[PDB]
Design a protein around this nucleic acid. Structure first.
Ligand code: ZN
Lengths: 139, 274, 184, 141, 37
RNA sequence: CAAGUCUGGGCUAAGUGGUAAAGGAUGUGGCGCCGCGAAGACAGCCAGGAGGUUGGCUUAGAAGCAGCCAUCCUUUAAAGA
């Protein structure tokens, strides 16, 4: 008969174990801690990896809910350069790259999250994450 | 104490081990000294009164020793000569080897690297039993020089003087020196431990373990509790019960297993020269 | 630049220091008159100005000549400019020291080491007409190793270096590295 | 340590320290420097002790210039021995430092670090010192 | 860091007091609690 | 203990004076330069102090907050990778 919730957990892709923080915060949820490793890995059976943020909200009759955001802006950028890891030491060492368009294509994939309602601004948030992992922008 | 008491003690458990099979007696398979298995400080403690009183035995009560190991860093190659020609049982044996360190947990590997046969067929067995042997007392403190690969790639001989034995020495010389030369390193024992603790105490639990020459490995939750795995040196791991039960007011429990051996922080190198 | 200066009759060049003013003297192949200027305003100008940019001096005789501090003698025990030497420029080409400007990060800038301003001032010559300034030096293709010198640089519309060339203008050297010991 | 490699005379007289400096009272190399306020005899060790902690403080830093160089034989008779019997044997060396003399100077480092490494150096030295920048150290040939 | 000859600021929260001709130095961490002597 | 508790201006508050150094210090007076200045400053109160993003590498885990680097973007009145 526990109280209510707007839980803002942060679970990756695939790893869906009732183990905390899916226990102490979702113990007052009555949450189907297993109707996620199916509802999730079904939509993310496509991707494969990349963490997927989530907000699980509980109510009265002891039922739950949860909507997920997009995968780290550092993800789509790793596949779009034949990368896995950043570059250890960003800036000086380039291990892959993205064009002036490939950055403007990604800013589309996550434009309904950031804050700006453009791409000359949005894309810069991407072009910024370029030197964050040592991945120069093809220009 | 003197071999005298070493007996009063035998009888000690010969009756105390029936009056309480909640313990275990063991003679350290590597260094005489015997261990006294308990179930908490007090336990062994109060035995120490009766076993010392109602048995009048008066021995020592310090802590166990650690099964160290010797080995090297750099690969070396030295001569193994012996020859003693004066007039008869000539005694003529001589060999050259290739000593090379192996990963901490490799073992013992020799190499019958003799071309045509400059070193007769019949003498190799013995030149090995010699190398194998010598590896007993380390070059540093005297412990099982292990984790290496040996290569016999040369050595001559004499038609009459050589002997199965003469070679066992020569080879026991080539080794008795390659380790001295390849910069030795006092390896030690690392354990696997798993403290079951309520993440309430956990915080310090991990700390304390860090400040124990140990390096943490993880904590995959269990029941209402949470488990911690990691490695540690048996030296800096003694009387852990009454330390774990400290950072946990009782709600703490652990296990322990062996794993591998690994170099001592140098500062602990000249330390052990005892 | 400017600077209020006055003539000195020649009386107690040390009573002026205590006074508060700095005894001087300017000259050239024609005239040399003993002078003196206040410190405040000489620190405040020489501190910057130096001997690269001319200083127009204003004397009680309306005149306001252009000169370069050819020399500033010190007080070693506590440095306190104690007497200058103003060279009154003309029209005739004369020698001075033009500042060098290191515009460009070398390779020792990622690798390591340090740019060494082995000589951030060169002796060139030119009519006081052409008053050059920071003579840009190119750096980048330099890595803890060799260096550059001679007179490999943008010599403005009339500058004609009066050094060698050959004098090692600047070089990059190995950083000091804590963990380094040679004694033993 | 540091010291002469060869020498015409193994032993030399004391002499006396006066004012002035004779020279090296201006920068010429680095960007920041340390100068002597009181006259004295800096031992090689004193120097080394500094130069070191100097570098120590900023591991992997720019270049340090020791602008002074010991070369005056430091004498000393054995312990528990009376006067006479000639002179004494050498102990170490010292560089005769006077006020206004630039002892060291660093080049290529953040002011914050330069002003610090020097501050420490000054502590290893037996005399009071000042940290100068580079203003009027122009032309001193 | 109580009694000593070189009393200084060991972290901004320190304060150089001087009650009774003696330079004291107080802070939030009783460790910095100094005093010259 | 013989002759000014002499006159004008200034500093010192420890009996310093009435004998010690490096090195400490919002001591106390006094000169300075250089910044912010009522188109609202200093202390100040109530406020906000975010989103890309747990930056990337490393690691048991590093999410502003071990440590390497890197330090761009954003919506703004403003918020540092
Ligand atoms: Zn403090």
């Amino acid at each position: 008969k526990k109280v209510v919730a707007v839980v803002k957990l942060q679970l990756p892709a695939g790893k869906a174990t009732p183990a905390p923080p899916v226990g102490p915060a979702l113990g007052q949820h009555g949450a189907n801690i297993m109707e996620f490793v199916k509802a999730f890995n079904a939509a993310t059976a496509n991707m494969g990896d990349a963490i997927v943020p989530v907000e699980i909200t509980i109510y009265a009759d002891r039922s739950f809910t949860f909507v997920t955001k997009t995968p780290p802006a550092s993800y789509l950028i790793r596949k779009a350069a034949g990368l896995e890891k950043g570059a250890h030491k960003p800036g000086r060492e380039k291990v892959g790259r993205i064009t002036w368009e490939q950055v403007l294509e990604i800013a589309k994939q996550k434009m309904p999250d950031l804050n700006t309602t453009d791409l000359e601004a949005a894309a810069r948030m991407i072009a910024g994450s370029a030197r964050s992992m040592g991945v120069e922008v093809v220009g | 104490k003197t071999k005298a008491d070493q007996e009063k003690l035998s009888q000690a458990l010969a009756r105390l081990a029936e009056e309480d099979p909640t313990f275990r007696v063991s003679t350290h398979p590597e260094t005489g000294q015997t261990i006294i298995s308990g179930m908490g400080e007090l336990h062994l403690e109060i035995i120490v009164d009766r076993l010392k009183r109602e048995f009048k035995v008066d021995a020592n009560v310090g802590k166990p020793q650690v099964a160290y190991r010797e080995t090297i860093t750099k690969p070396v190659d030295v001569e193994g000569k012996f020859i003693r020609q004066t007039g008869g049982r000539g005694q003529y044996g001589h060999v050259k080897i290739k000593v090379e360190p192996l990963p901490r947990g490799s073992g013992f590997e020799f190499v019958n690297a003799i071309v045509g046969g400059v070193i007769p067929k019949e003498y190799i067995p013995a030149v090995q039993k010699g190398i194998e042997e010598a590896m007993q007392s380390g070059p540093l403190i005297g412990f099982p020089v292990v984790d290496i690969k040996v290569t016999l790639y040369d050595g001559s001989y004499h038609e009459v003087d050589s002997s199965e034995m003469a070679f066992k020495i020569a080879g026991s010389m080539a080794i008795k020196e390659a380790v001295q030369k390849g910069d030795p390193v006092i390896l030690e024992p690392i354990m696997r431990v798993e403290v079951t603790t309520p993440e309430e105490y956990m915080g310090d639990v991990i700390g304390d373990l860090n400040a124990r020459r140990g390096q943490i490995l993880g904590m995959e939750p269990r029941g209402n509790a949470q488990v911690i795995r990691a490695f540690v040196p048996l030296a800096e791991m003694f009387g852990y019960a009454t330390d774990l039960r400290s950072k946990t007011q009782g709600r703490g429990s652990f296990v322990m297993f062996f794993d591998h051996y690994q170099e001592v922080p140098k500062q602990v190198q000249e330390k052990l020269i005892k | 630049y400017r600077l209020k200066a006055y003539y000195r009759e020649g009386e107690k060049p040390s009573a002026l220091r205590r006074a508060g003013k700095l005894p001087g003297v300017m000259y050239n192949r024609h005239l040399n008159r003993k002078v003196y200027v206040d410190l405040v305003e000489f620190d405040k100008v020489f501190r910057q100005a130096s001997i690269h940019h001319v200083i127009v001096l204003e004397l009680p005789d309306g005149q306001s000549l252009p000169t370069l501090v050819r020399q500033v003698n010190l007080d070693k025990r506590r440095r306190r400019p104690e007497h200058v030497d103003f060279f009154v420029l003309s029209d005739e080409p004369v020698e001075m020291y033009v500042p060098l400007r290191f515009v460009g990060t070398p390779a020792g800038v990622r690798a390591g080491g340090v740019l060494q301003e082995i000589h951030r001032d060169i002796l060139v010559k030119v009519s006081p007409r052409n008053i050059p300034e920071f003579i840009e030096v190119d750096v980048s293709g330099l890595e803890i190793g060799d260096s550059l010198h001679a007179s490999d640089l943008k010599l403005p519309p009339g500058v004609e270096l009066a050094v060698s060339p050959e004098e090692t203008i600047a070089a990059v050297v190995p950083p000091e590295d804590v963990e380094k010991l040679a004694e033993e | 340590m540091l010291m002469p490699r060869r020498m015409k005379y193994r032993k030399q007289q004391r002499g006396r320290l006066k004012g002035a400096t004779k020279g090296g009272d201006y920068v010429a190399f680095g960007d920041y420097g340390l100068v002597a306020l009181e006259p004295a005899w800096i031992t090689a060790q004193q120097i080394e002790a500094a130069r070191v902690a100097m570098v120590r403080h900023f591991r992997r830093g720019g270049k340090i210039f020791i602008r002074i160089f010991p070369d005056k034989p430091y004498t000393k008779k054995p312990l528990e021995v009376r006067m006479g019997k000639g002179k004494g044997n050498v102990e170490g060396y010292v560089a005769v430092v006077k006020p206004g003399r630039v002892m060291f100077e660093v080049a290529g480092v953040t002011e914050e670090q330069a002003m610090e490494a020097l501050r420490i150096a000054g502590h290893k030295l037996p005399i009071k010192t000042k940290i100068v920048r580079r203003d009027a150290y122009d032309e001193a040939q | 860091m109580k009694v000593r000859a070189s009393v200084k600021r060991i972290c901004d929260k320190c304060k150089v007091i001087r009650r009774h001709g003696r330079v004291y130095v107080i802070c939030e961490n009783p460790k910095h609690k100094q005093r010259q002597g």
